[PDB]
Subunit: 385 residues, 4 copies
C-alpha cells in the first residue's frame, strides 16, 4: 500500500504544518518551513501540495519577502517533482474578516477580500494550479438580525461573478471550487452543504467556471452521507476537487487523518471515486492531532495515503467479485440503472401493468436482499472472504 | 392572536388525524373522518386542508368508494369555505414502496409510483390545489451497495420530468414542490436538504415547474439554520410552499406544533416570511403528541396558528422600532445590501482604497454591534422592551 | 467465523421477529412464531433468545392461552438447547403507557406497570433468566411542564426499590439491568445515558441488585463514545448485560446489525469486552431492515455474529502483536495504569520534581505517538499488516 | 430587569476577557486587565467573578509578580464589593496538558497537574471561594488505543481523592464541582455528561466533598435536555455550581450569552432553579462573539443577566397563574408527586385494582392535556396571556 506520485495524493501546507492551537490550547509544535513540508511529503510519496496565500507568504510581507518565499518554495517543488494543483485564499484568520470576506457587512472589507483573492489567483496560475478553492468560513452569523441571507447571497454571487470575469479577462484555465461547511467558526455558515453550494453555482453568470470542493468531515458535521453528496456532485458534473479526512459525526471539525472517523463511509467514498473515474487530486485537509510530535505528523500523513490505498484495493475486489456481481443483480442494482419509461409518458399512461394490473402485494413481498449484499461488502472491507 | 381564513393557515388531514402510532407504540386515538377534521379546523380559523391520496381515499378503494369519499369531503369544504391549496401522494406507507417510489430499484414499482402520483394530480386539480408536494421519504438507503445515487438521481429526474410533461400536456397550472428530509425512515434520504433539492431542480427539463416545500423540523434534523435555508430558497425564487412545525435539534422527526422546538428559529422564520412577502399557505405538518385526546389535538392545532401570529406581531414590532432601525445601521445591515463593486472589476483592481491603502487594522477594530442588535430582538420576542 | 453456542450470542424475539412497521410504514413481513425464531436462530449458532412479556404471550391472553404459548416456547428451547438468559417487560407499546409505566403521571398506571413487570419476573425466573432488563422508553416528556423530573425520579426509585424487595422476598438470584436511551419515542427520556443510569442506581435501597444494559445505538444517539461508556460501566462493576447493534450517529434509533454503523467503535467495543473478560450474553437488539424478506432476516442475524467474531480476531491480534505492545509503551499506556501518587499526599507536596523542578517544556515536547498506534490498530482491523 | 448583587450573578474573568481567538481566527480584542473586568462587571450589577489560576496570574509568574497580580485584584474586589465564589485550575491551555492533567498518560504530568491545582486551592480559599471547579477538558482521546478508560478513571479517582485529602488536612470548607463536557477539545472527553460525573463521584472516598458544575451548552452538545440533567443533579443533592450560556444544539461549544441558543430550555432551567430554591451563584461561562468590540462585550454580559431576570419573572407568573395550577392538576402533575405504593409491596400485590380489575382502556383513553399546559407556558414566556 505504498503511495507514489501517480496516486495524485496532495496535502495542504496548513495540514502537516498545523502547530496544534485549538480553542482551549496553545501550540504543541514549532512552525514548519514550507520547504521542509514539501521535502517530507515527497519522501512519503505525495504528488503535490496546496496553500492558502498566508501559508506560503506571511500576511503583510514586502514584495522582496514575497519573492524570496515563492523562490524557496519553487526550488523545493523543483528538487522533489512535487506539483501545486490547487491554491486558496485565507479569508478567515485576520480579524478584519471577523464578519466575512465576500459577505462582510462592511463593503470596504468585501472589496479587500476580492483584491486579496485576485492577487493569489495570479500566484496560483504561476505555480500551475488548475483549481482555486474558496472556503467562506467567516460567511454567516451567530444571530438572526446580523446577516440578511438574501443580501449576503447577492454579495456572494457578485464576488464569484467578479472572480469569473477576472480569470476570463486574463485567459486563465483555472476553475473555482466552493467548499461548503455547515458551521464553525460561524454559528451557521452560508452554503452549508454540497447541495446549497451546487444550487448557488447555477445562479452565477458563468456556472461552468465553478464546482464544489466537498470535505468528508464538513458534510458529516451536518450528519449527512458524504458518498451520497459526492454522487450528487458527480451527477451535476461539479466535483472539481475533494478534501479527504475523518470525522466522528456531529461535533467540532476534527480533521482526523483519512480512514479515521467513519471508516465504512471512507470505503464507500473510495468505491465511488474509483468507479466514477474521478481524475482530480486526492487532497487531504487534515490535522495531525496536537498530541503528536513531528514523527507523528509524518505517520498521520502516511496513514492518510495508506488508508486510501487499502480501501481502493478492497472496493475494487468487492466490485470484481462474481458473488458480489450476482448479489447486485439479486438486489436489482441493474434495474435501478434502467430508464423507468423510455417508452414515454403516453405508453406509461396506457400500460395496465403499471396500475390496474400491477400486483402490488407480489412486488411488496420481493425481498431486496440488501443485508446479504452489505455483509459481502463488510467481508471485503475486513479481508474476511 | 385569533386566526381567520385570511392568515392562510392550512393543515394536512394526516396532522390532526394522526392516530399516535410510533416505532414503539400502538394508536392512542381513533381515526378521524376527514369531514370532522375540515369542520373542526374551520372552527379554529384555518383557511384550508391538504391531503395525501391515501388520507382522503383508503388505499385499494373501488371507483364508487372513491367517488363517495371525495363527495363527502367536497360537501365539508363547501359547508365551511375551507380551501385545498396543496395535495401530495403517499409513496411511503405501503410495503411496495419499501425501497422507494420514483427511485425503487424495481422498475415496475417506479412505473406504479408515477401512475399513483398522476391519478392524484388529476384529483388535486379538481379540488383547486395550486401546489403538488413530493416527499421522497423512501428514496435512499441503509447500506452503501443498495443504492447507486447517480443512477437513483437519473430515475428521480426521469420521474419529475414525466410529471412535468403530464401537467403541461393537460394544461394544468399546478406546480411541484420537492420536500427534502435528511433521514427517517431511510438511513439516508436522497435530496436530504433544501440545497440538494434546489440543485436537483436546476437539472430538470422544465425547472420553472418545480420548487421546494421545506419543513422546519427536516432542516433542523441536519442541524441546519431553517431561516437561512428559506432565505436561499427565496433568493432562488423557489419557495412554492412551506411546512411549519417544531423540532428539538438532531433527533427523530418530532413534528411538534409550530413555535415548539427552536422558538428563536420560529421568530426569525416568521420575520423572513413576512419581510419577503411570502404569499403561499402557512401550512402545518405537525403531530399532536400521542399523549393527547381529541381536545388536545385541537388545542395543539390552535397553538400552531397562535404562535405564528404572536411571532408575526413581535417580528413586525422589531423591524418597525426606530431603536432597532438605528442598531441595524450600526451593524451595517444597510451596507450588506449595497453592491460590492457596481464600479466594475477594472475600477476595483485600480482602487488603492481596496488594497494598498486599505487600513485592515482600523476595519478590524470596528465592532459589529451584533449583541446589542440581538438583545433588542430578544426583548421584542419576549415583550420586554 | 462460525458462531457456536459457546460464543454466548443471544437475540430478542422482537429482533428477527420485527415485522417492519416504522413511523411512516406498514409491515413488510408476516409475524414469526417464537418457535420458528428459536429453531432458525439455533441453526445459525445462537446460544439463546430473550423476550418482552408481550412478545411471548399476546397482551390480554387467558391463563390457558398463556400456558400454551409458554409450553410451545419451552419445547422449542428443549428441542434446540437454546437458553433464555434475559427477559424484560413491554411498558411502551400499549396506549395505557403513553406517559410512562413507572413514571406515568397517573398513579393507577404506575401500579399496573409494577404488577405487569412482577408477573413477568416470575416467568423469567421459571425460564432460567439471570438478568431482567428495564427500558423506560415512555419515561420522559415532549414539553417542560408535563414532567417534574425530581418527582419522576422519586417514582422511578420507588418502582425499582419495590422490584428489589420482590425478588429478595422470593429468594430469586435474578438481577436488574437498566437500559438508557436519550430520546425516541419520548422527546427526552429519563436516565438518557449510561452515566445517568449508573448515578441513579447508587440511590436505590439495594444498589447491588441493579446494573446497566447499555445499547450501542442508544449512546451513539447522544453522539457519545460507546466503548468509553462501557469502560465506565465495567469500572463501576455494573455491566450486567449489553445490547449490540449499529447506528449512524445522531438520528432515530436505526438498530442496524452489529458491525454496521460505526465499525471502528464496534472494533474498540469488542476489544474492551474481550480484554475485560465480560462473561455476560453477547445480545443483539437489532432490526433486519424492512427492505428484507425472511432470507434477509436470517442473513442479517448471521452477520451480527460474524462481525463480532471477525472483530474479536482482529482485536486479539492487535493486542498480541509485539509491534503494538512496543507502540503501547511508546504512548505510555503502561504509565497510565500506574498510580499517580502511591507515595501519598505529603510525599507529592514535598516532591520538587512535581512542581518547582518539573521541566514543563521537556514534558510538553514529548510526542504521544498515538497516530502510529492508531494506524497499527487500523492495519489490524483491515487485515493490512 | 435590572440586576443587583443580590441576584448572585457571577462571570469568569475568561468570559468578558476572551480575546476572540478560535480554531480559524486570531484575536479581535486586546487583553483585559482583571481590575477593569471587576470594575465593569460591578457597574452592570454583577455580584462576583471567578478565575482559572492562569487568568489571574500569568503562567510562569515569579512570587513577586504573583503577589502584585493578587494585590491589584483584591483592591478591585474591595473597591466594588465584588465576591469570588468559585475558582478553578487551567489544566488545558499549556501544551504539557495535551494528553490531560489528572489522566495524562505521563505520570509526571499527572503529579504536576495535582500540584498546580493544590496551589490554586490555597489561593481560592484566601479569596473566599466556596466552590472549586474541575473541567477535565484534556481528559480523553481522539483514538481508541491512546486511552484505557478504566485506567484513566482509576487515575481520575486518585487525583480527586488526593484533593479531598488535601482540603480535609487544611480544614478548608471549600467543595469540588466536576464540570462534564462530551467533546472538544478532545475527540471524546471522560465524564462526558452530568450523569457520568454524578456516577463517578459516588466511587470517591469522600463523595460528600464533590458535586457537579453543569454547563447549559455542554449537555446540549450531546443533544441532552439541560433542565432534566439539572433536575437529576438536584435530586442527588449535587448541584454545587452551574454555568449558564447558550448553545444551538449539536456543534462546537458556542458559549453564547445566556438566553441565546435554546430559549425555551433557558425558560425551563430558570423555572427549575427558582422552584428548587437553588442558592448557588448564577455563573455565566460565555464568550461575547469575536465580532464585538468592548462595548459589545459589556452589552453581551448585561444580556446574560437581563435574560435570566425576564425568564425568572415569566416562570414565576406561569407557576402562580390559577389557570396554570388548574392545567397542572388536569395533567396529573399532582399525582406524579404522590408515592406509587406507600401501602407497600404486599398491598400492591393483593390490589386487584392494580391488575385483574385495572381498566387499561379507560386509563389509555384519558388525555394528558399536555399541549394546553405547554401553550399556557408559551403564552407566559412570550407575554401573550
Ligand atoms: Mn475540516
Ligand atoms: Mn477543507
Ligand atoms: Mn417532519
Ligand atoms: Mn412535511
Ligand atoms: Mn435501539
Ligand atoms: Mn435495546
Ligand atoms: Mn462551553
Ligand atoms: Mn464552563
Amino acid at each position: 500500500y505504498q503511495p507514489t506520485p501517480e496516486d495524485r495524493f496532495t496535502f495542504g501546507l496548513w495540514t502537516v504544518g498545523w502547530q496544534g492551537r485549538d480553542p482551549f490550547g496553545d501550540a504543541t509544535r514549532r512552525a514548519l518551513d514550507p520547504v521542509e513540508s514539501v521535502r517530507r511529503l515527497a519522501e512519503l510519496g505525495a504528488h503535490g501540495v496546496t496553500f492558502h496565500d498566508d501559508d506560503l507568504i506571511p500576511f503583510g510581507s514586502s514584495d522582496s519577502e514575497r519573492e524570496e518565499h515563492v523562490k524557496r518554495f519553487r526550488q523545493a517543488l523543483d528538487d522533489t517533482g512535487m506539483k501545486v494543483p490547487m491554491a486558496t485564499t485565507n479569508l478567515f484568520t485576520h480579524p478584519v474578516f471577523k464578519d466575512g470576506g465576500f459577505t462582510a457587512n462592511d463593503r470596504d472589507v468585501r472589496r479587500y477580500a476580492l483584491r486579496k483573492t485576485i492577487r493569489n489567483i495570479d500566484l496560483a496560475v504561476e505555480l500551475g494550479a488548475e483549481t482555486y478553492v474558496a472556503w467562506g468560513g467567516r460567511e454567516g452569523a451567530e444571530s438572526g438580525g446580523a446577516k440578511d441571507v438574501r443580501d449576503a447571497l447577492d454579495r456572494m454571487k457578485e464576488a464569484f461573478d467578479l472572480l469569473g470575469e477576472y480569470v476570463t479577462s486574463q485567459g486563465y484555465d483555472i476553475r473555482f471550487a466552493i467548499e461548503p461547511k455547515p458551521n464553525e467558526p460561524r454559528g451557521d455558515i452560508l452554503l452549508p452543504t454540497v447541495g446549497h453550494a451546487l444550487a448557488f453555482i447555477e445562479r452565477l453568470e458563468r456556472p461552468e467556471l465553478y464546482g464544489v470542493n466537498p470535505e468528508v468531515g464538513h458534510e458529516q458535521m451536518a450528519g449527512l452521507n458524504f458518498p451520497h453528496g459526492i454522487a450528487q456532485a458527480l451527477w451535476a458534473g461539479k466535483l472539481f476537487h475533494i478534501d479527504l479526512n475523518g470525522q466522528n459525526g456531529i461535533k467540532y471539525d476534527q480533521d482526523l487523518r483519512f480512514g479515521a472517523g467513519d471508516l465504512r463511509a471512507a470505503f464507500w467514498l473510495v468505491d465511488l471515486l474509483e468507479s466514477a473515474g474521478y481524475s482530480g487530486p486526492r487532497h487531504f485537509d487534515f490535522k495531525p492531532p496536537r498530541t503528536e510530535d513531528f514523527d507523528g505528523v509524518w505517520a498521520s500523513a502516511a496513514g492518510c495515503m495508506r488508508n486510501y490505498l487499502i480501501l481502493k484495493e478492497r472496493a475494487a475486489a468487492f466490485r470484481a467479485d462474481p458473488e458480489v456481481q450476482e448479489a447486485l443483480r439479486a438486489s436489482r442494482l441493474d434495474e435501478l440503472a434502467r430508464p423507468t419509461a423510455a417508452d414515454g409518458l403516453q405508453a406509461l399512461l396506457d400500460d395496465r401493468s403499471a396500475f390496474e394490473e400491477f400486483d402490488v402485494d407480489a412486488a411488496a413481498a420481493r425481498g431486496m436482499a440488501f443485508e446479504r449484499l452489505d455483509q459481502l461488502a463488510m467481508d471485503h472491507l475486513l479481508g474476511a472472504r
